[PDB]
C-alpha cells in the first residue's frame, strides 16, 4: 500500500519507520508505495531550515488511504485521508517503493506490540485515524502535576498532550498505606495489581505503550516519551515478582531498541541512573541477558565499564548506608 505526496514545496528530511531521506524544494517526489501492510508506521519530518522541530504522523495503511500535503499556512507537511476512494486510486517512478525487509525484521521487532488503536488513545484526535506527534508535546502526567503543584484557563489542545499511563513511584497509587517500605522497595504490587491487572489488562498492552514511548523518544527527542520508556522499564526491573514471559520478552524488546538507537541521539535518550540501577542492582539485574550485553558493548562509559585516569589535583563526609559507629575495640599493629 501507498502514501502519495501532493508535492514537496520545501526542503525536508523525510523519515519512514527506521528509514530516512532528503527531499529538495520542489523535487518531483510523489510519495511512498509498496509499504508493508502488516504494521503501524511513522512518517516524519525535519525541515532543512533548522528552525523547525521534528514532527510526524503514525498510521496504519489498513485503516484507510492516506496522503501527505504541505500546508503553507501552517507551514508543515500534513497527513490526510482520501475519503473518496476512486479519487485516491487515481492519485510514476518518482513514487518510490518501500524497501525489502532487512534480515533483522527490525521494524516489526520495534513495533510488535504497537497498535494503532492504542496509539489513538495516547494521542487523542478523534476525527483522524492517524496520529500527530512532535518534539515539544508534554504528557498528561506533567500537565496534571503542574496544576497540582499550582483568570484565563483557555485550554491547551488535548491532542498536543501525550496521554501516557501515569507512572509515579511516590504516589498513593504505588504505595499502599501500611506497606510503605515494602511497596517502595519492591514495586511488584504496583506492577502486577495496579498496572498489569488494573490498567493494561495484559503484557501486550504494557509493551505496546513502552515500544511507542521509545519510538517517539527516538524519532522526536520528546522528553516525556523518554521518561515514560524509562519508567516502564524501571517498574518491571524494580519488581521481585514479574511473569516469566514478560522478562524474556522485555530483554528482546530492549535489545532491538538499543540496537536501532542511533549513536547521535543516545546522550539525550538514555538515562544513566535507570540503566545502571536496572542492570546492576534491581531485582531483575540478572534477567536481561541480551540487553546487558549490547549495552555494555555500545555504551560502556554510561555503565562505568570504560576500564583509569590520573587524579590531577592533590576530604570525606560521613556515610548514610552504614551504622553510626559509636565506638569499638580494635586489634591491630600499633
Amino acid at each position: 500500500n501507498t502514501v502519495p505526496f501532493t508535492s514537496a514545496p520545501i526542503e525536508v528530511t523525510i523519515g519512514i519507520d527506521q528509514y530516512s531521506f532528503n527531499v529538495k524544494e520542489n523535487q518531483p517526489f510523489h510519495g511512498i508505495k509498496d509499504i508493508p501492510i502488516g504494521h503501524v508506521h511513522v512518517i516524519h519530518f525535519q525541515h532543512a531550515d533548522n528552525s523547525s522541530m521534528r514532527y510526524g504522523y503514525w498510521f496504519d495503511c489498513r485503516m484507510g488511504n492516506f496522503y501527505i500535503q504541505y500546508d503553507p499556512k501552517d507551514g508543515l507537511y500534513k497527513m490526510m485521508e482520501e475519503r473518496d476512494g476512486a479519487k485516491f486510486e487515481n492519485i510514476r517512478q518518482m513514487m518510490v517503493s518501500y524497501p525489502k525487509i532487512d534480515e533483522d525484521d527490525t521494524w516489526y521487532n520495534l513495533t510488535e506490540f504497537v497498535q494503532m488503536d492504542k496509539i489513538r488513545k495516547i494521542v487523542r484526535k478523534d476525527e483522524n485515524q492517524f496520529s500527530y506527534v512532535d518534539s515539544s508535546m508534554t504528557t498528561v502526567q506533567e500537565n496534571e502535576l503542574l496544576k497540582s503543584s499550582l483568570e484565563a484557563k483557555n485550554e491547551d489542545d488535548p491532542a498536543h498532550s501525550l496521554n501516557y499511563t501515569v507512572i509515579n513511584f511516590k504516589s498513593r497509587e504505588a504505595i499502599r498505606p501500611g506497606h510503605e517500605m515494602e511497596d517502595f522497595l519492591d514495586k511488584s504490587y504496583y506492577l502486577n495489581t495496579v498496572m498489569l491487572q488494573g490498567i493494561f489488562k495484559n503484557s501486550s498492552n504494557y509493551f505496546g505503550e513502552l515500544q511507542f514511548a521509545f519510538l517517539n523518544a527516538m524519532f522526536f527527542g520528546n522528553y516525556g516519551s523518554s521518561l515514560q520508556w524509562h519508567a516502564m522499564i524501571e517498574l518491571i526491573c524494580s519488581s521481585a515478582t514479574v511473569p516469566k514471559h514478560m522478562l524474556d520478552k522485555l530483554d528482546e524488546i530492549l535489545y532491538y531498541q538499543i540496537k536501532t538507537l542511533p549513536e547521535q541521539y543516545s546522550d539525550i535518550l538514555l538515562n544513566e541512573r535507570v540503566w545502571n540501577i536496572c542492570l546492576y542492582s534491581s531485582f531483575q539485574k540478572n534477567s536481561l541477558h541480551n540487553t546487558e550485553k549490547i549495552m555494555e558493548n555500545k555504551y560502556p562509559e554510561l555503565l562505568g565499564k570504560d576500564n583509569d585516569d590520573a587524579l590531577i589535583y592533590g576530604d570525606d563526609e560521613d556515610d548514610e548506608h552504614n551504622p553510626t559507629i559509636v565506638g569499638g575495640l580494635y586489634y591491630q599493629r600499633p
Binding site: D49, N50, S51, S52, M53, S135, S136, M137, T138, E142, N143, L146, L150, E151, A152, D156, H160, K170, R172, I175, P177, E180, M181, F184, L185, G221, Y223, G224, Q264, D267, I268, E272, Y280, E301, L303, G304, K305, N307, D308, D309, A310, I312, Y313, G314, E317, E320, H321, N322, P323, T324, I325, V326, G327, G328, L329, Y330, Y331, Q332, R333, P334
Partner: protein
Amino acid sequence: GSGVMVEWLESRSFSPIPFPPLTYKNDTKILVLALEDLKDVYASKVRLNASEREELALIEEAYDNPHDTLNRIKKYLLTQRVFKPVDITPVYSVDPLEKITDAYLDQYLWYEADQRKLFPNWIKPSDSEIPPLLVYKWTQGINNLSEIWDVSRGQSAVLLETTLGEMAEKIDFTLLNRLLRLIVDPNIADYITAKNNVVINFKDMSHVNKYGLIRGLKFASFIFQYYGLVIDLLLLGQERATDLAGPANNPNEFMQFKSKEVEKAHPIRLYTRYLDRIYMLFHFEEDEGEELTDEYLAENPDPNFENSIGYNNRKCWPKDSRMRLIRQDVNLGRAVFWEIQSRVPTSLTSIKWENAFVSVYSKNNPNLLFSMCGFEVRILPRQRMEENDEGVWDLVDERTKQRTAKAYLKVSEEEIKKFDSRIRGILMASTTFTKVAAKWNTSLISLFTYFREAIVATEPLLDILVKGETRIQNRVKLGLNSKMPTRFPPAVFYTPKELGGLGMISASHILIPASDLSWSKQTDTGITHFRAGMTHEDEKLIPTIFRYITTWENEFLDSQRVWAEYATKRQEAIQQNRRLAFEELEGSWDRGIPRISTLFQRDRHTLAYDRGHRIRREFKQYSLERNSPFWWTNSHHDGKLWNLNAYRTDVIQALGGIETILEHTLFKGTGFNSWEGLFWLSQIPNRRFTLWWSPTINRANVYVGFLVQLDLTGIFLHGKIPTLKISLIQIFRAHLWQKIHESIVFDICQILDGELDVLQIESVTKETVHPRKSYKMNSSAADITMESVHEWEVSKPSLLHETNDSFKGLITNKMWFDVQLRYGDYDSHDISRYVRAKFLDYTTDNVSMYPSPTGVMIGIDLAYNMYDAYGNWFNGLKPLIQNSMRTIMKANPALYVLRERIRKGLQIYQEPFLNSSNYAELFNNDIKLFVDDTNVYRVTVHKTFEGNVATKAINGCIFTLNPKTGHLFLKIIHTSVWAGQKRLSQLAKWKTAEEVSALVRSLPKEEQPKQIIVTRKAMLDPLEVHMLDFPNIAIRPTELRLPFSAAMSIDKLSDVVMKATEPQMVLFNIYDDWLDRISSYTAFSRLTLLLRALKTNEESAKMILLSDPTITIKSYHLWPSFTDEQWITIESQMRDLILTEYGRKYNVNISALTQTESSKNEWRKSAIANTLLYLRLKNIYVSADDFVEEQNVYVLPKNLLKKFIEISDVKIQVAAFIYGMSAKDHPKVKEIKTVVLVPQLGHVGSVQISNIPDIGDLPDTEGLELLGWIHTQTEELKFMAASEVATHSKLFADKKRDCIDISIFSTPGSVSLSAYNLTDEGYQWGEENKDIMNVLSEGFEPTFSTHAQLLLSDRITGNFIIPSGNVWNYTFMGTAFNQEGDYNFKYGIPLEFYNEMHRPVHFLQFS
C-alpha cells in the same frame, strides 16, 4: 660465566639465602606486601569483570587466611616443579594462585638479598633513587672524577653506552640453576628454574618454554639482575669490580672510591647498568690510549680512514656540540668497544657496535655525551666554554664547591615519538569531550612530571605539544559543529570540571580575549557591569604547565638541604634525650626525595621490608596489560613529587574568576544567585556540556552564516550544534515561552488593579495578542493598556533604576506596558541596552501599533535571568514597577518552571535545598522541623587482627527539632526494634520516616510543620513516601552539614537514650530558656556553635562547659545557667576551640574572616578533666601481631581497664601491678585477676612506683602469679621508653624477668594498649641507668623490648588491691612518700587520682 660468580661471591663471603623457615620472623610482612601488590591492579576500577573479580576474591581469601597460605606456599616451593600454563598477549598472565607464591618469593628474595648485599652499588634501577635522580647523580659523579676534564697532557675520557642484546632471551636453565644455587637454597633454585620451564599459550599455538627468562613472573626482576651481574663481572673483571663495589665489610656508595689512587688505578673510572643498558666511563692518558688503539688497528686495519663511517653520534645536538669525528678519537672509541665486547661470550648476550654509542672527550672534543632513562645529556666543562640556558644542570666540584661544568638535557627522540603517538592515539580512538581532555591531561602530566626542564630545551617536543593541543581543541570543535568556529572562547576548554569545563592543562600560548572578560550582576537596586577596559592590569594568558613543576635540579638541591637538616634536627633532639616531633619538621614536609612526609606515614615500619620496589614496578610492564604512566615513582616510598593545585587556582583567576567564567554558561538561567559547587573520574555528557556553555558557544561571534529562530520561542540558533536544539526544545516544551509572557503580564495586571486609587488609574486592560507575539522579535504591540482618572504628567523615557526623573515631559491619559522576553547569549545579553533600543525602535515603528505615545517596555532575559524597563514614568509608577518586577522575578510560577527545566537539563538535579542563601527563613513564622537520623542506628564494633568485624547495636534516637521554638522531639529507638530484622541501615531510614510521620499525625493542624528538613539525603524518599497523606508539607534536603549528630554528646540526652528499656518519646527544649533574652536566630546559632564544638573535640568542649562548678544546670535544662556576659565568653571559647582543632588538623595558623560550619596548682583543672577520661574507652586499640601459640597470651578483664582509666590522670602517669594465673589446662593463657594500686609519685614521662607489694596475707593470694605492671602514658611509642625500661628493670631484674609491661597511650578519643617483654640486655641497661625520666638516653635501644600478646575480655572480671590507707597518689605528699617503703594492703576500690584523699580540699559556699 659462573666461574666469575664463584670467585666474586667467595670474595664477598656471600651467605646463601636459606629456605624460608616455618617461623620466619618477617613471613607475615613479606606476604602482605606481595598481596597488596597483587590487589593494586583493582584499586582503580569500580565494576569488575568476572575474572578480575574472581582473581580479586582469591587474593582476599589468601589475605584473610595468612598462615594457611604461608604453609601452602612453602609447600609448593619445597616440592612443586610442574605448573599451569602461562598466557601471553609481551604480557604474561600467570595462574592467580601461582602468582601468590611467586610474588611472595619475589619479596622474600629481594629483602634477603638486599640484607646480604648481593647486588653491588652499580646495578640499577635502585630503590635508592628515581630515574631522573640517577641521571643527575651520574652526571655529578662524572664531574667529580679526579682531574676528569684535564686535557693538558692529551688525556681522554670515553663514555661507552650499549645494550646487552637478548640477555633475558638466551638464559639457559641448567646454567641458571647452577648460578642460583650459589645464592639461594637449592629447593628455591629448582622452583625458580622449573617455573620458567612451562607451557606458553599464544593464539592457537602453545609451546613449552625451553630457555629464555619469562619476564612476567613476579621474581623475574631478581633473576634478570643476578644474571646481569654475571655479565658486569665479565665486563669489569674481579679486581676492578672489587675496587668499585668496595670491600664487603665496608662497601662504597655508588661511584665512590676508598681513595683517589684506587679511583685512578684502572682506566674504568665508572660503571653502571640500568637493566640491560650498560654505561662505562674510561679515562686514558695519551700513551695508554694510543697503545690500546694500535692493538685494535692491528687486528682491524683502517687504511683508507673509513672508521668515521657508521660511527654512531648524537643527532639531537647541533653539529658543533655533538662528537667530532677526529680520526684519533674515532679509533679510540672503536678500540674501547672492541676491547669491551671481547670480554663477554655471545651465549650470554649480544653486544653489537651498531647498538653502541661511544662518546670521546679530549683536546679535540669538548663535549661528553650520553643517553639515560629517556634523557639526552651533554656535559660541557667550564674550562672548555670557548668550544645555553634552557634545561641545564650546574655541575659543582664538591672539593672546590665551584661550578665546573654544565649538563645540557633534551628529551630523547624515542620519548618524543612515544609522546607523539599517545596524542595521535587519543585523536584516533573509538568519546565524551571531558574524556578526550582527561586523556590529553594524563599524557601531558606524565610527560612533564618526568622530563621537567629537559622539555623546554627540546624544540621538536615543544612543537608537538602545541600542535597536539590544537588538535585536541579541534576535535572538540568539530564535535560541536560541522562548520568550525570563527573564534572560540578558551573558557570552555580550560575552565576546571567542577565548573563544568573540560579542565584541559595547557602547554601553549593562549590569549584570553578581553571581550571574554565581561560579566554582570543584577541586584535589588540595579545592574552592575564589569569589563576589561575598566582595570589597568596585565593582558591574560591561559597558564601553562611549564611553570608549575619544580625543576629536577631544584628538587634535588632542596632534597640535599632538607635531609641534612633532618639529620641535624634528629641529632639535636637525641642530644636532649628526646624524639624528634613531626611539628619540628612542619615546613619541610612536602620537600625532599623521598618526601620528608614519608618519615611519619603509618605504614612505614612495614614498607621497610619492601625491597626491589623500583624494579618491581618497572617489570609490571611484563605481567599487566595496563599500568600507571607513573611507573618510575612510588608514592608509598617516594611521597608525592608534584602538586598542580596552584594551576587550577591560577586558570580560574586568569579566566576572570568564577563570576566571569559563569557568565559564559547557563548558570544565571538556573536562577541560583551564588555559586556553591554542585553538579555531581566521572565524565560530563556531551549534551550537558553543550547546554551549560551554550550562551558562549551558540552566538554569532562563534558561528555565522546559518542564523534561525527556533519555532515556539525567541531563541536564535547560530548553527546546527549537536544536541542543543533538542535540549532547548525540551526546556521550552508545551509553549512555555508564550506561557511565561502571559503569566508575567497577568501578574502585572493584578498588581495594577491594586493601585487604581493610589495612582489615579481608571481602568486596566489586558490586551489580547497574536498567538506568537511574545516571540515576534522584530515588532510588538501593547500587552496592557491603562486609563487615567484625570491626567498623567510623565517623564521623557528613562530606565527603571535611574533615579532622577523630571515629570515635565508630557501629559497623557493612556499608558501602555509591553512585556518583552528575550533569550540572550554571551555577546548580547545586556537587558538595559536591549529594552532602550527596542522601545525607541518600536515606538517609532510603522508596524508596531501602540495605543498612545506614552508607556513602558519591560524586558526579561530568560537565559540570564535579568530584567529592566524603559519608557515614560509618572509619579509613583517607577517604584511600583521596581517592586513588582523584584517580586515577579522571584515568584512567578512560569519562571519557576523554566528554571527547573533548565536545572534538569543541566543535571543539577525537587523542593529547594536549605542553604546559607535561604537560611534565615528558618526563623519566619512557617513552622518547620529538622530531622536528623544519624543516631538512629548506632553500633559498637569489635575488630580482630584478622579483619573480622562484629557490630552490636545500642539504643539510638531520632532528633526532630523546631529551630524557632527549641522544642526537641527525641524519639528513643530501643535495640528491640532491630531484633530479628535484616538490612538494618536501610530499615533505619524507614523506621525514622514512620516515626516522624506519626509525630506529624499526632500534632493538631495548628502546629503541623509546613516543611521538614532532613539533614541526610537518604531520608528524602522514605519520608516523602510516609508523608503522602500530607501533600502540603514539603520535604527538603540541605547541603549544610548541621551538627545535630553531636546531640548524643549532651549527657542528659545520652543518659535517657542509654537507660531506655522500651520505645519512648522524650520532649526537651534544646534552648533551655534562652528565648527570654534572645532571638530564635541567635539561640540557634548558639546551639549550632555548641554542637559543632562537641563534635570537633568533645573533651575540650565539655571542659569549657564545666570550668566553673558554681554555674550549674537546672534540673529541667540541658545547658548551664550562664549570664549573658558569660555566654559571650563561652561562645568565643568554642569559636576558638573549633579553629584551634581545625588548625591542629590542617596546619593553618590564622587567616581571613570568612566563617564556617594562685596560678600554680590548678590541679582543679585536671580533676574536672579526669571526669571525662571515661570517654576515651569508646575507642580501644590493642597492639597485636600474628598469633604465635608458642608464646603466652595475657588477658586483661574489661572491667579493670575501665576502672584503671577512670582513676588515672590526663597528664601524669599512673601505674599498678598486675597479678593472675594460667587458666585451667591452658598454661599459655595468663589471665589477669587483680590490679594492685601501689603508692607512687607520677610524672609526665615517668613514674616512681614503690616496690612489689607484699600481699601474701590477703585471701585468694595463694595461686596468684605476679605478671608485671600496667601504666598510662601520654606519648605513643612502638617500644618501651628508656624510663619504662629503667623502672621495669628496677622492679623485676632481680625477681621475675618474665614480667610484662602493659603501656596505655591515653589521649582524647581513645586508649591504645601495648604489652611488652624486656630483654636481658634491656635489663642490663636498666640496671646501669636508674631513675631515667626521658623517652631516650645514652645506650637506649627500642630493641630492648619485644611484643607481648594481649587480649581484652568481658567474659572474666578482675578486682583491686589498694594500700590499707587507701592513698596511692603521693603527688601532693611528696615528702611523705618513700619509694623503698614497706606498705600494707587490702582488697578494695581504688580512689581516683584527684579524689579528696589525694589532693587539697576545696572551699565551697556553705551552700
